[PDB]
Short mmCIF file of C-alpha atoms in Angstrom, two decimals:
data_model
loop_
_atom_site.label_atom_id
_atom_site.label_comp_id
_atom_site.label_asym_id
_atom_site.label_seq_id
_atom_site.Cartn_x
_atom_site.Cartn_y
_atom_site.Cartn_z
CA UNK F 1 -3.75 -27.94 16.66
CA UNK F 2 -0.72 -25.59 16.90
CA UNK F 3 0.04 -23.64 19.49
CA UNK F 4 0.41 -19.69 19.74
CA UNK F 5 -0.82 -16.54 21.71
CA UNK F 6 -1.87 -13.47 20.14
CA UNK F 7 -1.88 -10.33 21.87
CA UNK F 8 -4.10 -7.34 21.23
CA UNK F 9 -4.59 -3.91 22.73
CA UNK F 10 -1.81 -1.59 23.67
CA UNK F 11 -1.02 1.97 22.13
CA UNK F 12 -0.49 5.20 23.29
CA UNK F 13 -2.00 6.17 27.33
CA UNK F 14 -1.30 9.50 29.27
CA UNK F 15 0.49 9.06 32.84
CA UNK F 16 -1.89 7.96 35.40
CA UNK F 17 -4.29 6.22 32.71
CA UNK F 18 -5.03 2.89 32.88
CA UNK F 19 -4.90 0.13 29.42
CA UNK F 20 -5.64 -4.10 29.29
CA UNK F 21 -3.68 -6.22 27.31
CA UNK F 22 -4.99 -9.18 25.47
CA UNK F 23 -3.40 -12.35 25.20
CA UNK F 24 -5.56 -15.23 23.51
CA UNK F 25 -4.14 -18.74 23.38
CA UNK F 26 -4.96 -21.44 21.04
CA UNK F 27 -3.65 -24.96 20.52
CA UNK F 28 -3.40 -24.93 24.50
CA UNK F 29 -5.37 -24.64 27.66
CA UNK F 30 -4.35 -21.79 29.94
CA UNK F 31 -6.62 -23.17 32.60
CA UNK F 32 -4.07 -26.14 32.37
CA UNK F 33 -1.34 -24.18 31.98
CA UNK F 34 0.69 -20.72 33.43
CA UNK F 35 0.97 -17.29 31.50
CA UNK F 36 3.68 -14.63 31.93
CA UNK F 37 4.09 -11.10 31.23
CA UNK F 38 7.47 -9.76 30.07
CA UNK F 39 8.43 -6.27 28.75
CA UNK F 40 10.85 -4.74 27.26
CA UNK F 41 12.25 -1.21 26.88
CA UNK F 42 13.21 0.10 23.89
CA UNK F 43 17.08 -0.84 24.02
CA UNK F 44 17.11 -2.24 27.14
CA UNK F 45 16.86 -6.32 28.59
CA UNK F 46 13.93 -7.82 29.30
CA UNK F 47 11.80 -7.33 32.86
CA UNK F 48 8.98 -9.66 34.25
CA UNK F 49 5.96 -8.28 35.18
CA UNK F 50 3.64 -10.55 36.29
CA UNK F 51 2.31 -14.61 36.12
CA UNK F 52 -0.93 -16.54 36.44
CA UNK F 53 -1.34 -20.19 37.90
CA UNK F 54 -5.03 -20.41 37.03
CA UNK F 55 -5.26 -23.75 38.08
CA UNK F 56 -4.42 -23.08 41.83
CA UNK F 57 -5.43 -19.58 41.34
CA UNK F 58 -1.50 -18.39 42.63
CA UNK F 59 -0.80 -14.55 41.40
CA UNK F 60 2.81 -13.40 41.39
CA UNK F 61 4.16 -9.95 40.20
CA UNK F 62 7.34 -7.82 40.19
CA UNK F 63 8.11 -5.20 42.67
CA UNK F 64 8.01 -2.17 39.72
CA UNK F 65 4.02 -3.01 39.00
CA UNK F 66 2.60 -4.18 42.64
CA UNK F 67 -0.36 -2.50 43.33
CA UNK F 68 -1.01 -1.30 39.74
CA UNK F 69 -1.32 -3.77 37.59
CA UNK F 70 -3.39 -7.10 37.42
CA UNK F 71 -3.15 -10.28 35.74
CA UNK F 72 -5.85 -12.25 35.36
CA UNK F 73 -7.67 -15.04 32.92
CA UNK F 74 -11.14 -15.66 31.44
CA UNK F 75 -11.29 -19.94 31.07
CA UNK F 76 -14.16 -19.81 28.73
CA UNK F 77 -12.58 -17.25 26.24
CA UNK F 78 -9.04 -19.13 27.03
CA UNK F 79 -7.78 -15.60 27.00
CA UNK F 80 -5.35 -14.10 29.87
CA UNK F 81 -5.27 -10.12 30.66
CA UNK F 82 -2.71 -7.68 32.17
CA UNK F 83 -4.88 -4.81 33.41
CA UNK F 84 -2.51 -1.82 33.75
CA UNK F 85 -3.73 1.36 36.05
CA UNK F 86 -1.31 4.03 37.21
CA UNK F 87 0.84 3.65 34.18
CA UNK F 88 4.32 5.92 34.62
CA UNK F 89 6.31 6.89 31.61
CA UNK F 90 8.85 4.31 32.90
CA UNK F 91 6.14 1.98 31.93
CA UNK F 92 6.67 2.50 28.17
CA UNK F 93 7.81 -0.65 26.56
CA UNK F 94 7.07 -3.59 24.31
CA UNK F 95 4.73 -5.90 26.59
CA UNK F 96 4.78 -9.68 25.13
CA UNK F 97 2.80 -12.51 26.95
CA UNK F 98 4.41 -16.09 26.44
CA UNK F 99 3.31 -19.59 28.05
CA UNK F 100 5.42 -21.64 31.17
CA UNK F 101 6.79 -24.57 30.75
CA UNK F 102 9.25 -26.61 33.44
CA UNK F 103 10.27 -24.36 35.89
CA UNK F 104 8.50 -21.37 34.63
CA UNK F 105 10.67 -21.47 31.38
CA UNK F 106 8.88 -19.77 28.70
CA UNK F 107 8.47 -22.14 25.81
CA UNK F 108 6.01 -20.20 23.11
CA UNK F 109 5.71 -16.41 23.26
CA UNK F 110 3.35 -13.98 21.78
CA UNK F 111 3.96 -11.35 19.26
CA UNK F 112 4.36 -8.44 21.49
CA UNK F 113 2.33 -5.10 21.39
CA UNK F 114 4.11 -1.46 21.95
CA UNK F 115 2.70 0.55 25.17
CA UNK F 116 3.72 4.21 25.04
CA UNK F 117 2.94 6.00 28.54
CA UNK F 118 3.31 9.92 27.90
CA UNK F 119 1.91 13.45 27.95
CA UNK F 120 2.80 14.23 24.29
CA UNK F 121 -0.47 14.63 21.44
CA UNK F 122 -0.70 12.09 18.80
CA UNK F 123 1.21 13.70 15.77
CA UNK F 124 2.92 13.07 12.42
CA UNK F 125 5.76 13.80 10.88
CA UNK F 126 7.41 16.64 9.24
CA UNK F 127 9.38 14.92 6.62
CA UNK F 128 11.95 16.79 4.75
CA UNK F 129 14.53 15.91 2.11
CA UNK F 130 18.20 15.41 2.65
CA UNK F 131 19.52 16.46 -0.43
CA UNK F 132 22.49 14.80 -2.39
CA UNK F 133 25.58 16.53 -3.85
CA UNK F 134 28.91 15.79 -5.12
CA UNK F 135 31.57 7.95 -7.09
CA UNK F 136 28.78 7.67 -4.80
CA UNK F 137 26.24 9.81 -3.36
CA UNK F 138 23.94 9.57 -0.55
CA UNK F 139 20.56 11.27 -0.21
CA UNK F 140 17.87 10.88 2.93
CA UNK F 141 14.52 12.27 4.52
CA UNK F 142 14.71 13.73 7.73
CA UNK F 143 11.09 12.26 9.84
CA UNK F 144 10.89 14.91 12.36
CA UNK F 145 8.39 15.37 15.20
CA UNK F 146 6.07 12.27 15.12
CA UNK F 147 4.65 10.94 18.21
CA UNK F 148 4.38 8.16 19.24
CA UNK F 149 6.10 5.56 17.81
CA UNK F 150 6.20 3.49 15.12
CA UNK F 151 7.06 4.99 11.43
CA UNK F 152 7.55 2.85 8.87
CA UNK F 153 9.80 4.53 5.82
CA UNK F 154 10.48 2.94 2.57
CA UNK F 155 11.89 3.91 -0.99
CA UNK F 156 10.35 3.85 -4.40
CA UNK F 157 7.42 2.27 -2.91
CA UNK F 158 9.50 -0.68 -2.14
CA UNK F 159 11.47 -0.68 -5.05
CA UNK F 160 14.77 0.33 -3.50
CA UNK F 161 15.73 -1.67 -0.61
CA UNK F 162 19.75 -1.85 -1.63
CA UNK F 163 21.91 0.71 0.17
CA UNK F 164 18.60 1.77 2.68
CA UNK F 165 19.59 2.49 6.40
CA UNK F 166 16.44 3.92 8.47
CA UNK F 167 17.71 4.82 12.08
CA UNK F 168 15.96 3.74 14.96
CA UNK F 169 14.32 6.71 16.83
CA UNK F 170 15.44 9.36 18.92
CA UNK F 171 13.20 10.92 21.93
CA UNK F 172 14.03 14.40 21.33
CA UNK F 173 13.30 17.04 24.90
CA UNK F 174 10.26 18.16 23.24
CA UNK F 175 8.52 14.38 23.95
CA UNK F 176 9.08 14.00 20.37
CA UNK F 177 10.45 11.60 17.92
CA UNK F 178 12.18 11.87 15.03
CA UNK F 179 14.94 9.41 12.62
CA UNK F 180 16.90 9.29 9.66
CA UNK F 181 16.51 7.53 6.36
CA UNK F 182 19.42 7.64 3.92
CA UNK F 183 20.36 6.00 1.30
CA UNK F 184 23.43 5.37 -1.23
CA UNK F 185 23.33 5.33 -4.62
CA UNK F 186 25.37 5.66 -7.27
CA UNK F 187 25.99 9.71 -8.62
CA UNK F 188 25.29 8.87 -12.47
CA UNK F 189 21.80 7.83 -11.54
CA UNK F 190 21.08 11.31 -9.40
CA UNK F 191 20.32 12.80 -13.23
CA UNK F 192 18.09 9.69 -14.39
CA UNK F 193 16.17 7.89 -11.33
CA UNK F 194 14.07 9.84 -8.68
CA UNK F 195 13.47 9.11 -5.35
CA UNK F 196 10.92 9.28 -3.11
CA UNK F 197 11.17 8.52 0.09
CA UNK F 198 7.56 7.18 1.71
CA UNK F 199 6.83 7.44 5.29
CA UNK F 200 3.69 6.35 7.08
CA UNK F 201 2.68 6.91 10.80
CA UNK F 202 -0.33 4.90 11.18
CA UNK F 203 -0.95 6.44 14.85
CA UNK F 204 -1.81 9.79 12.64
CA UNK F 205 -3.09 8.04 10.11
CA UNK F 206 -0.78 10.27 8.07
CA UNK F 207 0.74 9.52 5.25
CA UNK F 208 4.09 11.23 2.97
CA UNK F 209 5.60 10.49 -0.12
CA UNK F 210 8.58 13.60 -0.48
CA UNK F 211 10.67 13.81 -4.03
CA UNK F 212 14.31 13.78 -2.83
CA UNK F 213 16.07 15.96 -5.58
CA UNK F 214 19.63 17.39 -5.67
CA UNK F 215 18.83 20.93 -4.52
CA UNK F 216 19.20 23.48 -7.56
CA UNK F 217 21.12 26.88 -7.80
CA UNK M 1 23.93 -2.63 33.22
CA UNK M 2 20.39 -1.77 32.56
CA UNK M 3 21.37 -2.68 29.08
CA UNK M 4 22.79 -5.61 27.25
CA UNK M 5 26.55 -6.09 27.76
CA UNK M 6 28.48 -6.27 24.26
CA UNK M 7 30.28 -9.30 22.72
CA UNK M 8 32.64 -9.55 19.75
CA UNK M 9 32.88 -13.20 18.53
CA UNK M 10 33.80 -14.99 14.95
CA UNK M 11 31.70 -17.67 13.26
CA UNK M 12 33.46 -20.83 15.07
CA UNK M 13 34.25 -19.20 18.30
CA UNK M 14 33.35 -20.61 21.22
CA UNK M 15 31.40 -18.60 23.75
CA UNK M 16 30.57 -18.88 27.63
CA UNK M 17 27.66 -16.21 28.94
CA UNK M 18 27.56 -16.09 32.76
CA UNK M 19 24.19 -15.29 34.08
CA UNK M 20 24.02 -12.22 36.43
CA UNK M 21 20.28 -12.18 37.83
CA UNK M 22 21.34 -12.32 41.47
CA UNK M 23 20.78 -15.56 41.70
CA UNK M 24 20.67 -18.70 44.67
CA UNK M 25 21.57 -22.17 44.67
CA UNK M 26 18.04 -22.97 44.79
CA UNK M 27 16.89 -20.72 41.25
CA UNK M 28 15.54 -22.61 38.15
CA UNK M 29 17.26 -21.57 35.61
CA UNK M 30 16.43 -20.89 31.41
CA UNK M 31 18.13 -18.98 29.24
CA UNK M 32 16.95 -17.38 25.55
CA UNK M 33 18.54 -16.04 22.39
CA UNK M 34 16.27 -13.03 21.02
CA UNK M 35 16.76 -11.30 17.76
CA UNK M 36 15.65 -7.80 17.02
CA UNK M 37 12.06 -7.26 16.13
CA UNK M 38 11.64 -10.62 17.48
CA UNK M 39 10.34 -12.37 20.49
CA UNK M 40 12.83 -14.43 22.42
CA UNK M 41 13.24 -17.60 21.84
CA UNK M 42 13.08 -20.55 24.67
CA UNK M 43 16.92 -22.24 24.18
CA UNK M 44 17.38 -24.07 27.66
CA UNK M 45 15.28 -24.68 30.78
CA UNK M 46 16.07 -26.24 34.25
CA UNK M 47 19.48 -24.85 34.53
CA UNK M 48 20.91 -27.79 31.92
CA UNK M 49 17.86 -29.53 29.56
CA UNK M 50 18.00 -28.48 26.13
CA UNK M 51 14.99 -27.14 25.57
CA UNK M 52 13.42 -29.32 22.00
CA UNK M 53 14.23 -28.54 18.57
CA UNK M 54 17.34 -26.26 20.23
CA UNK M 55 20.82 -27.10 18.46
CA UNK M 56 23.18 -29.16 20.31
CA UNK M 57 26.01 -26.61 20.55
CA UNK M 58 23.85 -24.57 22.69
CA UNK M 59 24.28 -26.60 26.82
CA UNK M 60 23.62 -24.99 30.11
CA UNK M 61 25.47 -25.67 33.49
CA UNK M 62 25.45 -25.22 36.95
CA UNK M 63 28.63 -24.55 39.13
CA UNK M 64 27.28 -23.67 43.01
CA UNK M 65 25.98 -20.62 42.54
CA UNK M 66 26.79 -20.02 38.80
CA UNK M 67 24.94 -20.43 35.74
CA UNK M 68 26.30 -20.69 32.35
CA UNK M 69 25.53 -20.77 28.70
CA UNK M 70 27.80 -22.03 26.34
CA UNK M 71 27.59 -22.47 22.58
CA UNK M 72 30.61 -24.47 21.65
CA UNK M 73 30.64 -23.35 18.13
CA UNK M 74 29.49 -20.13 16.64
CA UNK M 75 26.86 -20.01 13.90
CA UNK M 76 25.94 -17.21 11.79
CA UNK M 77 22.52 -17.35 12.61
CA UNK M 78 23.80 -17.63 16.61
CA UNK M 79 24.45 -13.77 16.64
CA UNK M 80 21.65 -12.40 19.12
CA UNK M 81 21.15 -11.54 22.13
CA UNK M 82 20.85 -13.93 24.79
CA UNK M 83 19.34 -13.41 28.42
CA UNK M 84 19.49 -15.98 31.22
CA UNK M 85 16.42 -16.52 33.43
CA UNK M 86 16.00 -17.27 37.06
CA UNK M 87 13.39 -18.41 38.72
CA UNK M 88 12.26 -18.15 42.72
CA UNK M 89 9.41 -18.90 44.58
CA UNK M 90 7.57 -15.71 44.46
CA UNK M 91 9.55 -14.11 41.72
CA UNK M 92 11.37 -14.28 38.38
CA UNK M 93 14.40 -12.08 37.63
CA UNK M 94 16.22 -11.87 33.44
CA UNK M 95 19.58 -10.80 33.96
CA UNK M 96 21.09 -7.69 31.99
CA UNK M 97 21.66 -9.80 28.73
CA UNK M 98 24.79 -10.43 26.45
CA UNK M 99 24.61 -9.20 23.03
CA UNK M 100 27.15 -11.14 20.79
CA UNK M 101 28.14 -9.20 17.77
CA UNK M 102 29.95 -10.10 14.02
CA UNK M 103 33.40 -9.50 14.39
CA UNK M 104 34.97 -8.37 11.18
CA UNK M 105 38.12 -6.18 10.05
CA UNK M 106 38.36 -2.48 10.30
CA UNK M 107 36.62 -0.15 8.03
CA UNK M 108 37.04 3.18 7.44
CA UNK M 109 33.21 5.24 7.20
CA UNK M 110 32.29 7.15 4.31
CA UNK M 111 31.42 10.81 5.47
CA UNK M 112 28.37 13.07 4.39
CA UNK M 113 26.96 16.82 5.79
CA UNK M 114 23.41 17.33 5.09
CA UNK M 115 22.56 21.13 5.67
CA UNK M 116 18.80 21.76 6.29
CA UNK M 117 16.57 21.76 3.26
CA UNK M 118 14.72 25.40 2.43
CA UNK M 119 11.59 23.68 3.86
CA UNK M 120 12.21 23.18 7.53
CA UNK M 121 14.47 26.34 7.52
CA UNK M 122 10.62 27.88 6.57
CA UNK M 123 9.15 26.20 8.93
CA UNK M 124 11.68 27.69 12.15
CA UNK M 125 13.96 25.20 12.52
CA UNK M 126 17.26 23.94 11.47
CA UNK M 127 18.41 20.11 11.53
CA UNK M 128 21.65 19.66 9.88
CA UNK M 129 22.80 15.81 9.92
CA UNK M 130 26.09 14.49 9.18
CA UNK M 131 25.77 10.80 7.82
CA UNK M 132 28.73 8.16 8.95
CA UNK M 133 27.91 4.95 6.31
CA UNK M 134 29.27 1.44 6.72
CA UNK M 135 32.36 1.33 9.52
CA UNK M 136 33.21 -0.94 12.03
CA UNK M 137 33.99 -0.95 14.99
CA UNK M 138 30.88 0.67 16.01
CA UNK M 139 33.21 3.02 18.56
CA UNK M 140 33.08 6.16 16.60
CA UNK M 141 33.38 9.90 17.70
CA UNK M 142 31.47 12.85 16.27
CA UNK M 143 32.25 15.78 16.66
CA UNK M 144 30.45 19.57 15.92
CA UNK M 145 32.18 22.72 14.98
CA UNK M 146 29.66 25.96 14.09
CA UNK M 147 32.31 29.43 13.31
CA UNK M 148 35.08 27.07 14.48
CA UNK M 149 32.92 26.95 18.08
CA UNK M 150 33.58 23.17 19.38
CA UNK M 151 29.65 21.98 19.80
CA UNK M 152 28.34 19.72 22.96
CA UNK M 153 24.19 19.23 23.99
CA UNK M 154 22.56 20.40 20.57
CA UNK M 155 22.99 17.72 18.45
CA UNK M 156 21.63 13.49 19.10
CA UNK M 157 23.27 10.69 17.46
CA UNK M 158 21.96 6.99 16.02
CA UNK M 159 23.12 3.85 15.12
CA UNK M 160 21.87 0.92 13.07
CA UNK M 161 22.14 -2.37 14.11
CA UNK M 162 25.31 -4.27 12.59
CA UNK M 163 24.51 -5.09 8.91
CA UNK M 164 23.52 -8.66 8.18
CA UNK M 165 25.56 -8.43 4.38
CA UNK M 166 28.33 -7.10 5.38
CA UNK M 167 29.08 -6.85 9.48
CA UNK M 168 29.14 -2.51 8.98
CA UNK M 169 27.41 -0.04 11.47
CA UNK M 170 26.22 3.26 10.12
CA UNK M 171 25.36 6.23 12.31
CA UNK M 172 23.39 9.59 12.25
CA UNK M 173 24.33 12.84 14.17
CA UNK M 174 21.94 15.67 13.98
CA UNK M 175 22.76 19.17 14.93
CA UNK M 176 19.31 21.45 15.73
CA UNK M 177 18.98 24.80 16.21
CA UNK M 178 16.12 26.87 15.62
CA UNK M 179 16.20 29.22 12.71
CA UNK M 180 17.39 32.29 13.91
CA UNK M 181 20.92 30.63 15.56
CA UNK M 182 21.54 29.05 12.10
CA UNK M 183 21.39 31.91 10.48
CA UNK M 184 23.73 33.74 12.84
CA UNK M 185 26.68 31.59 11.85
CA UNK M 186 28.30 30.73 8.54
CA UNK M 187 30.77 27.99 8.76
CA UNK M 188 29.20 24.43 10.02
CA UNK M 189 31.32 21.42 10.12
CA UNK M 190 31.02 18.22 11.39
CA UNK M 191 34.56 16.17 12.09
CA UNK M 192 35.01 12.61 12.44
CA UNK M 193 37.45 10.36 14.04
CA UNK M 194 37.59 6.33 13.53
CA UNK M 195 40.06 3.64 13.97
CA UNK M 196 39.93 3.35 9.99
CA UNK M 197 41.24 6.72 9.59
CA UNK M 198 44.75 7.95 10.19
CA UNK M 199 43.25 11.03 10.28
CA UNK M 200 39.65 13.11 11.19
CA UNK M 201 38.21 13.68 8.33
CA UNK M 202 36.00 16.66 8.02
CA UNK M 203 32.94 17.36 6.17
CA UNK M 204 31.60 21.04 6.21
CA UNK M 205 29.61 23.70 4.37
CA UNK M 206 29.35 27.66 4.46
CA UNK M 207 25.03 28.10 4.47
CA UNK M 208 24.16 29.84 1.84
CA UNK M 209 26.41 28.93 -0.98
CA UNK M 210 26.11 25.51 -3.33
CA UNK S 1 7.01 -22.58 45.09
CA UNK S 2 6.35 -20.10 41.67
CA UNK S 3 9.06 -22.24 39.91
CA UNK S 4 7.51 -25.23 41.04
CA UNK S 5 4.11 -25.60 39.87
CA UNK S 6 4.31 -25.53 35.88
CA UNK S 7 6.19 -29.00 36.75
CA UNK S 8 3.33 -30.37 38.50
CA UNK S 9 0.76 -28.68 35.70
CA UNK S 10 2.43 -30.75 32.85
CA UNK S 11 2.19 -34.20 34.87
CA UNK S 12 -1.87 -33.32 35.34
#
C-alpha cells in the first residue's frame, strides 16, 4: 500500500464565514501517526497553521489562527480536518495537509486546495483580444474581471503551446482579477493560421473561446 | 522578507542557504525544495539526516545556533525554492525561503503596445498593455507616457516565472482607464529601459489611427 | 515536546 493524502473542500468564503478542509490518508494510520497544516500565500513562503498528535491527543497551532480554527481527526474514516471559522482575507491561501515524520519533518504532503476569503461575487471573465500588427508578431487575450481565482487559458485548443506566456494574476482595487495571455508567432502565418485563445473559469462555470484577428481598417 | 529572498546560481555552483526562522539551539530542524504548482518536497530532517531517496549533494549542518543547507553541486532540476524548518515544543516556524534562480547572459526584450480592442472600449473601459517578451535579468523598468504626461498608479505589472527552455522572464504592464480619459488623450506610449539596451526603447500609438 | 513525539510515534 502506498502512501498519500488527498485533500478536499476549500473554495471561495466571505469574511467572517467559516469552511473544513479534508485531508484523507491512505497507505498510513493517522491514529499512529501526526498531521500538519501548512499554507501558503500566493507569492509568499510557507506558514504553519496547525498539528494533530492523535495518539496522545496533543493540539498545537500558530498564533495567526488561535481561537479560530480547529484541527481535528476522525480514526475510523482515517481522515484529519482543519475547521476554519472567522476566516479574514489575510486567510486567503493555498492550504496543503502533509504527514510528520522525525522531529515533525514533513515527509509526504497532500495536493493542496486554494481558499479564497473575500467580499467579491463569483464572476467570469471579460476576455478580449490583443490584436497583432507589424519578423515576428505577438498577439494575446486580455482575461479581465474574473473572481476568484483560478483561470485556465490555452491556444488552439491545445494545439499551440510554443511561444505561450499566460501571466499569473493581478488583484486589481475593484477585488478583481484579471491576466495576460500572449503569444509569438511568426508574421507570415497572421494571413494563414487563426487563433483562438480559450479561457475557462470553472468557479463561473463559464466558458470563452475569442478569434484573435489582426484588427482591420 | 515576507517573501522568498532571490538567488542567482549556475548549473555546478555550489550553494549555502542559511535558515532564518528565529531559531534556538534546542530547534529540530528540516529543510524542503518546492517547485511552483507543486507541494514541497521533504529534503532533510533532524538538522543533518538526509531525508531517503534525497541526492547526496543536498547535507544539512548545525553551527551553535545556525542552520545550513548546502548543495555542493548545482543541478538543473535543483532550481526551486527551498525553505528551512524549525521545530519547538509548542510551535513550528518556515523561515522566509531562498529562491535560487538560472543564471544566464543578458538579453535584450522584444517590445509590443497593445491598444484596447473596440470591444472593451464598448464596454467603458480601456486596458492598454505593453508586452516585454524573453529578457533577463528580470530587473526591468516600465515606464507610461499618455500626451507626453509621465504616468504613476494607473497601470499593474506581471511577470512569468523564469523560462525552463531558455532561462528568459517576460512581463506584462497594463495601463487602465475608463473610457472617457482614453478618449481625452491622443498620444500613448509605453518606454522601456533594460540592461540589454543601450538605449529605452519606445513603443507607442496615436488611438484612432492603424 | 511538539518536536518530540513523532520520534516516539515511529518506535510504537
Amino acid at each position: 500500500s502506498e502512501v498519500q493524502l488527498v485533500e478536499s473542500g476549500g473554495g471561495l468564503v466571505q469574511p467572517g464565514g467559516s469552511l473544513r478542509l479534508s485531508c484523507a490518508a491512505s497507505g498510513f494510520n493517522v491514529s499512529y501517526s501526526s498531521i500538519h497544516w501548512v499554507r501558503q500565500a500566493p507569492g509568499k513562503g510557507l506558514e504553519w497553521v496547525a498539528s494533530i498528535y492523535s495518539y496522545y491527543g496533543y493540539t498545537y497551532y500558530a498564533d495567526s489562527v488561535k481561537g479560530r480554527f480547529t484541527i481535528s481527526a476522525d480514526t475510523s474514516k482515517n481522515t484529519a480536518y482543519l475547521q476554519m471559522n472567522s476566516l479574514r482575507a489575510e486567510d486567503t491561501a493555498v492550504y496543503y495537509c502533509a504527514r510528520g515524520y522525525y522531529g515533525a519533518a514533513m515527509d509526504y504532503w497532500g495536493q493542496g486546495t486554494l481558499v479564497t476569503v473575500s467580499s467579491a461575487s463569483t464572476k467570469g471573465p471579460s476576455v478580449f483580444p490583443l490584436a497583432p500588427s507589424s519578423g515576428t508578431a505577438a498577439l494575446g487575450c486580455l482575461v479581465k474581471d474574473y473572481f476568484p481565482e483560478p483561470v485556465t487559458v490555452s491556444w488552439n485548443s491545445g494545439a499551440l503551446t510554443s511561444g505561450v506566456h499566460t501571466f499569473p494574476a493581478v488583484l486589481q482595487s475593484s477585488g478583481l482579477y484579471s491576466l495576460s495571455s500572449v503569444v509569438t508567432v511568426p508574421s507570415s502565418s497572421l494571413g494563414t493560421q487563426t487563433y483562438i485563445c480559450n479561457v475557462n473559469h470553472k468557479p463561473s462555470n463559464t466558458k470563452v473561446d475569442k478569434k484573435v484577428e489582426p484588427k482591420s481598417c | 522578507t515576507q517573501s522568498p529572498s532571490s538567488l542567482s546560481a549556475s548549473v555546478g555552483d555550489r550553494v549555502t542557504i542559511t535558515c532564518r526562522a528565529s531559531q534556538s539551539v534546542s530547534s529540530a530542524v528540516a529543510w524542503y525544495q518546492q517547485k511552483p504548482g507543486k507541494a514541497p518536497k521533504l529534503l532533510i530532517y533532524s538538522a543533518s539526516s538526509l531525508y531517503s531517496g534525497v541526492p547526496s549533494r543536498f547535507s544539512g549542518s548545525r553551527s551553535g545556533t545556525d542552520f545550513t543547507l548546502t548543495i555542493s553541486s548545482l543541478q538543473p532540476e535543483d532550481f526551486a525554492t527551498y525553505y528551512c524548518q524549525q521545530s519547538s515544543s509548542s510551535l513550528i516556524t518556515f523561515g522566509q525561503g531562498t529562491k535560487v534562480e538560472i543564471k544566464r547572459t543578458v538579453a535584450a526584450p522584444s517590445v509590443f503596445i497593445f491598444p484596447p480592442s473596440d470591444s472593451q472600449l464598448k464596454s467603458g473601459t480601456a486596458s492598454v498593455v505593453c508586452l516585454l517578451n524573453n529578457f533577463y535579468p528580470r530587473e526591468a523598468k516600465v515606464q507610461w507616457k499618455v500626451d507626453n504626461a509621465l504616468q504613476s498608479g494607473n497601470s499593474q505589472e506581471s511577470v512569468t516565472e523564469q523560462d525552463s527552455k531558455d532561462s528568459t522572464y517576460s512581463l506584462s504592464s497594463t495601463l487602465t482607464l475608463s473610457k472617457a480619459d482614453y478618449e481625452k488623450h491622443k498620444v500613448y506610449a509605453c518606454e522601456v529601459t533594460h540592461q540589454g539596451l543601450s538605449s529605452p526603447v519606445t513603443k507607442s500609438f496615436n488611438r484612432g489611427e492603424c | 515536546n511538539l518536536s518530540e513525539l513523532d520520534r516516539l510515534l515511529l518506535e510504537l
